[PDB]
Amino acid sequence: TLLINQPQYAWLKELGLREENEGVYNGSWGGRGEVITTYCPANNEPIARVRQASVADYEETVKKAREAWKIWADIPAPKRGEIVRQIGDALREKIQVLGSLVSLEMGKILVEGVGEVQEYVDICDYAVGLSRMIGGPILPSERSGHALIEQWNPVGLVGIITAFNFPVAVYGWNNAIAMICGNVCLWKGAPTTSLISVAVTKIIAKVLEDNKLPGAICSLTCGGADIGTAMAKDERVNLLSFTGSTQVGKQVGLMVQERFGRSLLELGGNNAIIAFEDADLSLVVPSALFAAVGTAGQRCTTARRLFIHESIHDEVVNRLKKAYAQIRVGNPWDPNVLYGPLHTKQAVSMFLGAVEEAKKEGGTVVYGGKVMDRPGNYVEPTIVTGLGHDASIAHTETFAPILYVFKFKNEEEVFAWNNEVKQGLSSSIFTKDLGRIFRWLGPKGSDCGIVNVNIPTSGAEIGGAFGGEKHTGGGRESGSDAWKQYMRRSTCTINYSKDLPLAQGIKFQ
């Protein structure tokens, strides 16, 4: 009954996976908690089992990790970068089998599964050069015979909690950056993607062991809300990087703040695209489609609100409807599929709930809006017109392929409509007007962390810092100087002169 026991899935063994796998690594493999079975979202068939972490499993892991840091922190950063470089190569060796696993356990199409592995590979090679660059400036002191310097040091243990939609890349961003910065990591992934977590951990573990380093440098404790809450309340966790829903992310933020710890929050998005009258419709229409239905609309940066100028509204919508009909559905591991299933059945139930509510709030389903009659968690990509921009269902984030479409007249009101929501991740405008673009990038423009022009809301790369504002959390990952979130700044004044302070009337010696 298990998929891994079938001959057509023998490639899973290339990742070191078995019928039942250990979900805890801290130098040694284990797991005394509940055994979980993960399923294929494309056909609802069981893949394999993973033994999750118990409470005691977690305690020993944190302790060994903090013990491993004593060794890891003494290693020069460029030498820490060389370790990450080897991690990048090891991922290259398994890029096809691991990407296939992502498509199998998570549900995204094959080219995106492999692409997600490639993101980890790229940020590794990026982290290598960065490992020779991290540091602060030498500042000129106002005091004669004194030096003023800014030092950066690791915070220690970096706890990493990731979500289902990107079960490889998000960890990879945090991991590669935290490692070169001299920290040790503890990983708790989404329970429904444990096999991927185990597979990635297995690749890194070997690299650490071959270099005679303690494996606890990149620890793993598979588990649910119990393990996650524990990490947020644990003073031994110096930084908790959390990626997930806003409702959970809010509670994560409060618990860490209660113990004066550090948090890095990457939460929900309600991303909008704006098309003006002077926009290239040949560019606009497909950009809208791919950003709205991409990964079955389960990206953090998925387009969920589409604002179109009155002059071109009906045309764009109709041209979108004809295009939606040409979207090829099917199993995610097939070389012609563009659209796979949703990750859970609950997501299907939430998809329907938002649809029923959208019609109740006065919206009209112009395409899709129904579950597909087929095995797996398949729903139709959906377009909804007629809603007010301030509709409740429209300001609510649903992790499903539902695109709310609105009309607007002037630039001023449509910039405000983009900013009126609680989320603040990504945003895009399509136009050619030079002045409008610079306004969009200015203080009266978009309030999001990602502000794009003539490219959809998923436009982002390794070179820049990734994250959002407001209810998205304010956290940043990967590029720019985001590494500073994984280190602590100290401002240091050094007296090297033999000069003594003014006596101020006091007789010493």
Place this chain on the structure above:
Amino acid sequence: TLLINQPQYAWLKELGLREENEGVYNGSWGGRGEVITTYCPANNEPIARVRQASVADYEETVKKAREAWKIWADIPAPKRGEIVRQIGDALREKIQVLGSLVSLEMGKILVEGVGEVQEYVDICDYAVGLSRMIGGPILPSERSGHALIEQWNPVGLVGIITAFNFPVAVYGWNNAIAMICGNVCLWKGAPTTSLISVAVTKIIAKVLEDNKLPGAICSLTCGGADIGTAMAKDERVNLLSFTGSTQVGKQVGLMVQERFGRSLLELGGNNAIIAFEDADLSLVVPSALFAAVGTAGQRCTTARRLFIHESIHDEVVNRLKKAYAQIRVGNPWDPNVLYGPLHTKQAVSMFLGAVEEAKKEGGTVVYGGKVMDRPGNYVEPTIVTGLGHDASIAHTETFAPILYVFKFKNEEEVFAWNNEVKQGLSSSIFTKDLGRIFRWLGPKGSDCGIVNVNIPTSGAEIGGAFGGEKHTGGGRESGSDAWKQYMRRSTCTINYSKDLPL
């Protein structure tokens, strides 16, 4: 009865202060809240009165601030820098009279009063150049025909809450930086330093008005915990910079996180000095004294813990005793004075409580430990030996001149003792060992935000970021790239080619 009504204090009128003053500014002056009277800690006599902000006063002020931002944000940063330059000049014009007010209402000596105003002047002149520099890099995209840029924009309204011990400089740091970054400010200082807040606002108000700008750019709402709490819960406050107690700062952080706002926290410190066997004792003894009794031990960065190696412990303790006996107390606005009074009568009572508790936990008072019999809130600078490093009173932050002295043996254990407290503001070592210094600055060294060598825990300047770790809050002010806390980062991809997607 009011000091301001007395001829010997007529200099107060040079700052525009009257018998009763308005504690609210948002373009107009007002205050429908409680009338508060502030006292001089040197003689316990009332100085003047201030009408605080009502609930309606606060609500109206926020609205005018967010309206003022619409104009302020459209102004180019270097031109915002020009205003900041003018603010610096207006402070120069009142530096001596304003500094005297600091000594009168707060209690610190004159040279520190004038000195605190100078810090505001210096951060202004710094911010001028900084206004032509703030921004992000142009990065090379992996995509052909695309541009990748990092943009920085103002966060909007910056709420600023300050404490009594530094009632001018802390606001100045936040104000000067936030202004050039295109934000508007709303200030709530300590109730017992309301006159200082009013006087400072008066100087800035003049600058804004002469330049035909809305006064709400730098608003003032005098009040207590109710105003502070309202700001912490107000969604219209995009960034709240709080300086104060660890206990109160903790709740502020929770309230701000609850509504997904931004906070900048500058809380308590339990700063330590470490003297090794190879240290220059001619340098150590005065460094400790000035860092321990400075401002009657009411600085955030005041030295409260002194670790000395066994070989030189008794000698250093003795040499501190002889130097402590020469410390001149008296009126803070008086020359040759090095040591002023405590801020409140309550602080004197807490000083005694810390003294009695130190004796109960097994400590020995080798100097001081008593109240001085004189008008005002004067106490003796105190030295305590014999406590264990893990003593309860030693991990407790008391805003009074009490120096706890400890012995240590090895480098490893004394570094840990420096880091074992909940606070993480400032720290210092005195030594000549090259390796020891770099370990101190390294990952197995100090966990504080300010890590000094051969200079006491009050060693810091404008050019660098000021702040601490752990229970100190993690926030930073003034130098380096601390300005990023007052702005929002955006990562921007611009497609300019004619290529269509696959």
Place this chain on the structure above:
Amino acid sequence: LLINQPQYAWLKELGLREENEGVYNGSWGGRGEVITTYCPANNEPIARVRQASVADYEETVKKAREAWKIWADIPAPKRGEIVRQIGDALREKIQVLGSLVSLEMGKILVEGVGEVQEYVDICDYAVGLSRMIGGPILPSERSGHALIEQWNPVGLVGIITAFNFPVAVYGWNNAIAMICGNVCLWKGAPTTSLISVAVTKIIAKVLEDNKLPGAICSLTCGGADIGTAMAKDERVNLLSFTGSTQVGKQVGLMVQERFGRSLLELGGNNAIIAFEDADLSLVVPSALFAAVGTAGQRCTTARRLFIHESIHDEVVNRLKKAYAQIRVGNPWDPNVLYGPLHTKQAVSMFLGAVEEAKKEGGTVVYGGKVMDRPGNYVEPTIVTGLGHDASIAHTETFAPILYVFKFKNEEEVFAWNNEVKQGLSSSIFTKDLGRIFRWLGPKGSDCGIVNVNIPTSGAEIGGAFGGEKHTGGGRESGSDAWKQYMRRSTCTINYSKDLPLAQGIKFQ
């Protein structure tokens, strides 16, 4: 002398007399040849200045290097405080100094005052900069080691400036080099000696008020002999030269000969390009002001105008009508937009270029003649019909002569902008999103200044200022230009107790 007349009594407020000392190194002097400067508006003598002899130069150089011994030990933020006070001293005299600029050089009053403001702004900028300069602490690959990047002053910075900007260029170099901990030696244009003296007088007071040796900002007024000496002098650690390309070439060669540092800000042949989709309401006035500004004597003055064929004739006509409205007159008089050329010699160079353009096949559509009036006034001139590769068009002439060209496609007009030897400033007027990024990219303009919808004189203090190719490559004012005034050292510090591998050898 104009200074002996009551209507110019304001000149005495700058401390200027009938005859002035042209050497300052803590003490004032000058044993060289006496030079007399004239007002280009009426060819009347203003005052005299005694220039530096050879011995004057030697004593000045020696005293400057002694002053550096003190100056370098002063903390950078405290050096910034000195620069800040220099800024305030300039504010107090901004109106009279700007008036002197108009009198002695010839540019209009609003630009004269503005140039003083340029010195003032860069001062206030350098103040914050004095708390920021430095390098990174880098992570060493070696355990127990530190890797740091240090910056230190180069020592003595010689500064050579030109006539057209006798205040701002020196000011740029002064404020930056000072906060970097260097001492300066200034040789200005001989025809703007009074301005050099007036500026030196203001700063000297500031240094004296702060009890600093005056040689930190030294002055040695002189001609080619002083310039030649500075270029060959090993005691001159960095030489900043602003002037003609032909002389700048020889200056660079002399400095390279002795392995010194040079900062060259030389000539430009700057072009504006207007495409069909450009806002003609923006193009026409922008073009005029950039072409006729300061009588076309700026380094960044527009000398080449490329217009798209479809709108060429219209733009030319609208420029002809606009040129007719240019108000000429005395530079120290309000509503005046156009003053005289700096020298009478320049007028002869103006006429020579006009006749040579017509000989090469050009057509004068406006101006091209001398004005019958006192001073060095010439008509602002427009020339059409020349080929883009015309000899007169590739030559930098310091006169108000605008060469107009037609083009068809983007590719060729980008190349025509880059085909000249000069590479200072450049501008395009367009709205096409793609064309702008190509203009800013590797296949676009090769200049140091690359503008969009703004004329060739578009620049500000926050950014680095300078050009490429035959312009010299030097940068001034903004960005990380300060690195040109300091020396980089890469420093590895061993603080561990570890000994190197013996590799089989027995020590101790």
Place this chain on the structure above:
Amino acid sequence: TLLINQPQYAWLKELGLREENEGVYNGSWGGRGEVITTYCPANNEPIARVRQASVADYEETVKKAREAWKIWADIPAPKRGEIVRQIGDALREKIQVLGSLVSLEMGKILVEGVGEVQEYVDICDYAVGLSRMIGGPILPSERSGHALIEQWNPVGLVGIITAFNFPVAVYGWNNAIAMICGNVCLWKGAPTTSLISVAVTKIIAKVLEDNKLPGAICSLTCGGADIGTAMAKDERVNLLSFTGSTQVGKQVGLMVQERFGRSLLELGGNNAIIAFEDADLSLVVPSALFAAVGTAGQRCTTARRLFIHESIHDEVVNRLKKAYAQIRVGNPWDPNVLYGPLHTKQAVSMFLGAVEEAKKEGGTVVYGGKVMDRPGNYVEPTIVTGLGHDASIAHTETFAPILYVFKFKNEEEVFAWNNEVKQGLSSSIFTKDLGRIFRWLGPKGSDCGIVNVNIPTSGAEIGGAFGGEKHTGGGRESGSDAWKQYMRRSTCTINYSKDLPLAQGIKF
């Protein structure tokens, strides 16, 4: 007779080397110039032959390179970095055979041969991350509705001339950085290491070709002074990176300055180590030896001057004499060997010439000073005492293992003795005094580009910029913001508002 025709050297074929090899690559292999034979300095036996570039070979290559740039410059910088990354892997795959070629043809011991290849591998991996980082800041404009940004673009063609002592790493530094910065390269290595030049190019040739890129991006033209001079005079070479002797570098610098081009100069050094009384002699003695005799004392960063405090001089020298006697000499491709031959027989004649000149000037040889009786170019590592610090031979850079030893009394004078030479590459002090250390790194300390503490003069790594001052040339390579030397800066102002310029009285 050829070593490559002998079976014991068959590993050379793993690098694609044959009996006679092509010394020109620009997409195709060729070479119509003079045929050169390279020899092994360990036994003076011929290895293989190389056909050098003729003039016609040079012209065609430059043309193809500049045409190849049109494609290379349009490729995104991170995509150029991906190319540099593969180049690193190709070097990794051949590190042992290539390192052996370095030891065979140049003469350094095997662990250093491999080490030099490893440095090229490391700068590739560094440059990968750097390719996503290069660029300038977006500055806040003072002008409303305007944007201010600093752009960086490639300079075009990067000519690279290298020397014998580091025939792999020096090119590698320049190649990797210039490539990600969007430039194309033209390489002319030392004639005596032509095989190394060919072998490296072949490794790169495969990488470019496998990615369907024009091979001229990393071109090769093997040749001597005739090829080198042309590169210095060719206006089509936008940046010339030259590593070599001070005497030649000066002439290269002048020729490049003559045509207003860019130069990057990495020239000679006369590097000094200083030992103070409080220094750890257990650290000093091995540091001095390894820094003085390493690579047979033929590094640019070789310790050539040793300053020791009066109190500890005789002890340090005596301890050095005993350690020098333990230096194991022999063939470079054998383990436990620390000292190989000099690169040429001419270097042997100049090694001896310096020894004889030291005795004539009053020096005493306390160790070595004679030729070794064996095949190849082997000489004894030499120590010289008793010389004045201003001895002519001490100020002369000799590429041989000769250490001149001096005594000093006070800190001030020995700092001055460090700075008195024309060269300005590397320098080191050994001490524990905190104040002395900060003075040494400060404005009154060393004037060199590399300033180390308690680590010898060869202490440097990739993360930081590498280069020297004064007569060393001023150029920088590898780390920090050294990449700026391979690109041109532009300061760009963009008006995006609808605002029109002030009319100033004119009606449009």
